[PDB]
Structures are given as C-alpha cells and as structure tokens.
Amino acid sequence: HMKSIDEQSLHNARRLFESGDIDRIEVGTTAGLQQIHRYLFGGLYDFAGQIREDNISKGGFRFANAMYLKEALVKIEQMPERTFEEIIAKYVEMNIAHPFLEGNGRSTRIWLDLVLKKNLKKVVNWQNVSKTLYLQAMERSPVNDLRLRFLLKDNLTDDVDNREIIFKGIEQSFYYEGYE
Ligand SMILES: [Cl-]
Ligand SMILES: [Cl-]
Ligand SMILES: [Cl-]
C-alpha cells in the first residue's frame, strides 16, 4: 500500500547513509540538523528543514519558545563537543529546542551520532536501547541528564560503519516515535 510519511522518511534515512550523503553534512550545527531534516522529510512535510515559528508541546512539556528559538539555537550549536558528557549536554539542549514542527527526535538522533562519531569515533547502538528506557531518560534529561548519559554510554559502539548497526538503529529510532 502507499507509503506513509514515516515509511518513506525511513527509506530516506537509509538512503542518507547508503549514498554517503551522511558524511557530507555539517556536524554539530543547526544547519547540519536542518540538512538531516530536509533529507528525511523533503517532499513529505512542507516545513522540511525549516525552523518553526509556532510553539509545540508533548504531554505537559513545552519545547523552547519559538519567540527565542533562533537565539537559543545559535548558543546551542556553539556548545563544545570534546567529551561524551559535553556531547550529551549539547544533545539535551537541542532536544529541548525541538526546532521543527515534526521529525525532531529522528533527525536529532542522527545529528547526535555524527557528533559522537566525529569527536569520539563512536555512535549509539540504538537497537539495544529500549524505547521505554530511552523515553524516560529523555523525560528526566532537562533536570538531570545522568540517566541518559549512562544509558547511551553503555550502548556506544566503535563499529561506526557497520550496516546492521546503522540500519537496525534507524529502525529503532523510528520505533521510538511510534513507527514499525
Ligand atoms: Cl524552555
Ligand atoms: Cl553544559
Ligand atoms: Cl521525530
């Protein structure tokens, strides 16, 4: 049957890697995040790659106000990346920013992995990170990122070019957002 947006965006994420285009994106920047989002969602959402002007919330959590989101992003992208701790802190702030109307989770996990790969030569082996544990670590992270740090640290891999880790990790990442 016709592909859904989630199904086609999953195909687009696989192609981002298969084509090599993944390694031609800026790492750790707002623009690089926009490039990922545009790759995943171009042709699917009208706002692919575009910083939102509206507010958004999920449960009782409101993401950064659109009113100062651009300003927040400039500071976020300048955060340092030389240790695991620093990289997770930068990711936590980019998650709080949540700069698109949709597609933040999936795009920003790819963004995180590129920062880890550049600076540590590791990525997250997402297939082994349970949805429940991931979502509760993320819910705690604005106040206390320790649970998230340890969860992700225990699931790092140095096998950053392995197809199965990459493709199963895309699958898992999309499953965090409800798609299987
Ligand atoms: Cl806030
Ligand atoms: Cl910090
Ligand atoms: Cl998402």
Side-chain angles (χ1 to χ4, degrees):
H1 306 292
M2 180 173 73
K3 292 192 171 53
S4 65
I5 288 175
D6 286 347
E7 184 171 12
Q8 183 61 45
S9 61
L10 181 139
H11 283 225
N12 294 343
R14 294 171 60 94
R15 181 174 77 253
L16 177 59
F17 286 87
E18 196 77 80
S19 68
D21 290 344
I22 186 63
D23 294 322
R24 291 187 271 274
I25 290 180
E26 277 199 343
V27 177
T29 65
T30 303
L33 183 61
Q34 290 176 275
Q35 290 168 310
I36 295 163
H37 192 269
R38 187 166 65 249
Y39 207 108
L40 266 56
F41 300 109
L44 302 174
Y45 285 132
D46 291 350
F47 55 82
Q50 297 180 338
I51 308 302
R52 69 183 161 78
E53 296 284 334
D54 308 308
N55 286 323
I56 56 165
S57 66
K58 202 150 174 204
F61 191 85
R62 195 189 67 189
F63 300 99
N65 194 317
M67 185 175 65
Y68 51 77
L69 172 59
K70 294 177 197 73
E71 292 78 11
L73 291 162
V74 163
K75 297 278 182 291
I76 295 162
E77 71 182 345
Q78 290 164 13
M79 292 173 76
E81 302 169 5
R82 183 195 68 83
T83 67
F84 180 77
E85 291 71 24
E86 284 176 345
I87 293 166
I88 301 312
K90 184 171 186 164
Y91 174 63
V92 164
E93 297 311 319
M94 191 60 91
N95 178 65
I96 290 163
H98 235 68
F100 311 103
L101 288 176
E102 300 281 355
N104 296 285
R106 289 162 288 181
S107 61
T108 309
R109 281 182 292 274
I110 292 168
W111 183 91
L112 167 60
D113 277 333
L114 290 174
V115 177
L116 293 166
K117 187 171 73 184
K118 171 178 186 180
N119 290 286
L120 306 177
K121 302 184 181 353
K122 298 176 182 207
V123 296
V124 180
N125 201 348
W126 298 102
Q127 72 186 310
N128 295 331
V129 176
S130 85
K131 180 175 179 172
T132 293
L133 291 175
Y134 175 72
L135 293 174
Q136 176 61 228
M138 290 302 293
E139 187 158 21
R140 285 168 180 272
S141 69
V143 173
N144 186 333
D145 76 2
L146 178 63
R147 196 170 295 186
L148 183 67
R149 281 188 288 119
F150 283 15
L151 177 64
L152 301 185
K153 181 172 196 89
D154 286 351
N155 289 282
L156 295 173
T157 176
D158 63 16
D159 196 9
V160 301
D161 289 329
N162 184 266
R163 298 172 67 80
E164 189 76 358
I165 288 168
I166 287 163
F167 292 139
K168 291 280 190 254
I170 289 169
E171 290 174 13
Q172 188 83 340
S173 176
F174 275 61
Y175 161 63
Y176 294 159
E177 306 303 323
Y179 179 73
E180 313 180 61

